[PDB]
């Protein structure tokens, strides 16, 4: 592994991370000043449980989707077996979805862009998980703190989703080399960027599979598939 060879990882993953954002930095950055009107909050705490989760799992769905690709433009992600895709993309698929968000939330307001406006907490009273949302924004809130770059986003997501801890995979020895070229990709990038400190300010592994468990729970209480189970992708 050449630094030449571990260059071109962090351009390829990072460009792959530009064609599979799913929205611009930019244009979130720009429609912080349009926040939702208290009439339109109203309204939408105002709608039953259920239009709420089928609204909600429409967006993570079509997130999903955009994640998934990403991981196909990730290298050596097809060369792996179904099954091993299948596992790495099951388990880390939720926990992309929620580092991304991090790009929605605004700190000043402590709102997130839902459906063309920022809006805060206050939005998703229907569902009545209240524990569940503060934890999603107060996650969201230290990843916004940190001023994460697109570029350490997508380092990061990509460090997400391949890990051969994962139960179920049988190449394991494969995924563990695609894991520690991406770990030597992050390190170098961080080294570059003068960025090593956030390395030791990240959120812990426990905690991004906490919220992304109880998450999928609250999904299989109504009546909904793991997203993996229900996808339109591997078609």
């Not at 388990?91 to 000043?108: S, T």
């Amino acid at each position: 592994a050449s630094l030449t060879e571990i260059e071109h990882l962090v351009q390829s993953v990072c460009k792959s991370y530009r064609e599979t954002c799913q929205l611009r930095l930019e244009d979130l950055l720009r429609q912080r000043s349009n926040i939702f009107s208290r009439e339109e909050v109203t309204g939408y705490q105002r709608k039953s449980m259920w239009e709420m989760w089928e609204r909600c799992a429409h967006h993570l769905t079509e997130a999903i989707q955009y994640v998934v690709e990403f991981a196909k433009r990730l290298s050596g992600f097809m060369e792996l077996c179904q099954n091993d895709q299948i596992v790495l993309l099951k388990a880390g698929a939720m926990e992309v979805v929620l580092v991304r968000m991090c790009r929605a939330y605004n700190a000043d307001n402590r709102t997130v862009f839902f459906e063309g406006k920022y809006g805060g907490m206050e939005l998703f009273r229907a569902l009545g998980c209240s524990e569940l949302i503060s934890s999603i924004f107060d996650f969201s809130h230290s990843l916004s703190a940190l001023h994460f770059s697109e570029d350490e986003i997508a380092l990061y997501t990509a460090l997400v989703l391949i890990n051969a801890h994962r139960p179920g995979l049988q190449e394991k020895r494969k995924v563990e080399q695609l894991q520690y070229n991406l770990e030597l990709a992050f390190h170098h990038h961080l080294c570059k960027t003068h960025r090593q400190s956030i390395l030791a300010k990240l959120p812990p592994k426990g905690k991004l599979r906490s919220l992304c468990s109880q998450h999928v729970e609250r999904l299989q209480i109504f009546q909904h598939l793991h997203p993996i189970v229900v996808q339109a992708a591997f078609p």
